């Protein structure tokens, strides 16, 4: 009973920035803030304004404004980080700083002799070794950089079956911490791809069953 030994290596990248906000959530936050204001009582700023103005009027008939002005000036002078990062490039799709709002999966294009499709970076395992060890070895060899792929568990994800001699594919995921990719100008077609781009790039059924267990958000 011959069985060809293959695998798979899907990359998991945590998002940096949050998803955009909807108007109904804005109205909900506004009404929650109004309820918080109506429920709050005896605050430091409220007193430091009210009793201070009362003392001012009393000693005039016989702080806070400058402080909030300085606060507004310091807020206007300090410019926060520009969140506009997915629209100023629109070309460098294989960059780490491309998408920072959702999850990104990495895949490498490889043209074989009988097959000419865009398969996820597989992982060949040997009977003399384990499975996760061979998977992480193949992930380290196909990445040619210094990365920290923290696996979320020894259990697999999804399996398939294709014959012509039997074969099998073992999917494995690992959480990525930092991104120290050396030499981003390699000839390997490793592009950071999210969800919609992933569903648009693939074509056969062996890849259409991958978007069912990935974090769709």
């Amino acid at each position: 009973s011959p069985w060809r030994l293959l695998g798979a290596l899907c990359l998991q990248r945590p998002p940096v920035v949050s998803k955009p906000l909807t108007p109904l959530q804005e109205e909900m936050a506004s009404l929650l803030q109004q309820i918080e204001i109506e429920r709050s009582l005896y605050s430091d700023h409220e007193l430091r304004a009210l009793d201070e103005n009362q003392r001012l009027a009393k000693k005039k008939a016989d702080l806070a404004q400058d402080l909030e002005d300085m606060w507004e000036q310091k807020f206007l002078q300090f410019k926060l980080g520009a969140r506009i990062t997915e629209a100023d490039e629109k070309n460098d799709r294989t960059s780490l700083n491309r998408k920072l709002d959702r999850n990104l999966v990495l895949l490498v294009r490889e043209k074989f002799g009988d097959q000419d499709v865009w398969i996820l970076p597989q992982a060949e395992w040997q009977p003399g070794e384990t499975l996760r060890g061979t998977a992480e070895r193949t992930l380290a060899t196909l990445s040619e950089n210094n990365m920290e792929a923290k696996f979320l568990g020894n259990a697999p994800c999804g399996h398939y079956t294709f014959k012509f001699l039997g074969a099998k594919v073992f999917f494995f995921k690992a959480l990525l911490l930092t991104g120290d990719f050396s030499q981003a100008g390699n000839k390997g077609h490793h592009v950071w791809v999210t969800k919609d781009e992933l569903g648009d790039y693939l074509k056969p059924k062996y890849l259409a069953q991958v978007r069912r267990f990935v974090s769709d958000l």
Partner: protein, 45 residues
């Protein structure tokens, strides 16, 4: 999926105002923190 725990509310009965203040860490990132005194910038070394 980061908005499920964003719209919050203080369930306590007696409390003061918690203005949405911003704070920058030792790298460059702001965060909305509900804290009194309507400050704008917190330079934490």
């Amino acid at each position: 999926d980061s908005s499920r725990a964003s719209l919050t509310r203080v369930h306590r009965q007696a409390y003061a105002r918690l203005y949405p203040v911003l704070l920058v860490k030792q790298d460059g990132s702001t965060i909305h923190i509900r804290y009194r005194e309507p400050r704008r910038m917190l330079a934490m070394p």
